[PDB]
Design a protein around this nucleic acid. Sequence first.
RNA 1: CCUUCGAAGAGUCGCUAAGUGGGUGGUCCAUCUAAAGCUAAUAGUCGAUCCUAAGAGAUGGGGAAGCUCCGUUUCAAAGGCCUGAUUUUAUGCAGGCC
Length: 53
Amino acid sequence: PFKLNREVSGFGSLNRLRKIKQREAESRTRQFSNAATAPVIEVDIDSLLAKLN
RNA sequence: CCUUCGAAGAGUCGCUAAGUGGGUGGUCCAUCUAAAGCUAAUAGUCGAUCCUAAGAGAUGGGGAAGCUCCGUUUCAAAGGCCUGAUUUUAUGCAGGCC
């Protein structure tokens, strides 16, 4: 398995607000319906890996 | 016009208060509302210049209505220097000496 890089790494004020903004966008990209018939969520891996590389 | 409400200056008045309270007058009555404020009518070479001596005298602080006085290192945050791969949640100075 590949060792990727986390999006925001730090706890200073700038990094803490980066974390806030990154979590705020996670409520809209990785949605899970908690249902048996939930679809498998597929996203744009190219952009994410651009963030994680 | 109708209806529902309706605060009031304390080390102050007089050691130290009150809220139909209080202040001042009159032989019970009369009159005002303090302790807040505004408002017109011939020298690098000789000396000084530099250094400190007895002493004087700022700052810190204190007294006095004040012009000013006391006190000279005093319960003052009274200033200089050095080191470092750039300082470990990521490039907002850390440590040391007198």
